């Protein structure tokens, strides 16, 4: 409602997507780093993508 029709959903969905991307990778890496498992972010970002 703050932004218009062509950008209320454009960047609004992007904010949800971008925030979820960094959140999802952190939570997944949190499990593996805690257990002493080293996995590059590439293998996780592909799944999150």
């Amino acid at each position: 409602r703050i932004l218009g029709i062509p950008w209320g959903f454009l960047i609004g969905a992007e904010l949800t997507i971008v925030q979820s991307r960094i959140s999802l990778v952190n939570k997944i890496q949190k499990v593996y780093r805690s257990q002493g498992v080293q996995i590059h972010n590439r293998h996780i970002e592909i799944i999150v993508r």
Binding site: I2, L3, G4, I5, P6, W7, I11
Partner: peptide, 27 residues
């Protein structure tokens, strides 16, 4: 769905006005 100061005249729609939405995005 219908079968006075008429203040509706000042309700300005900015559909398609890219410059207007950029200002609100900035602040």
């Amino acid at each position: 769905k219908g079968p006075v100061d008429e203040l509706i005249c000042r309700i300005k729609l900015h559909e398609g006005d890219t410059e207007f939405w950029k200002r609100r995005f900035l602040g």
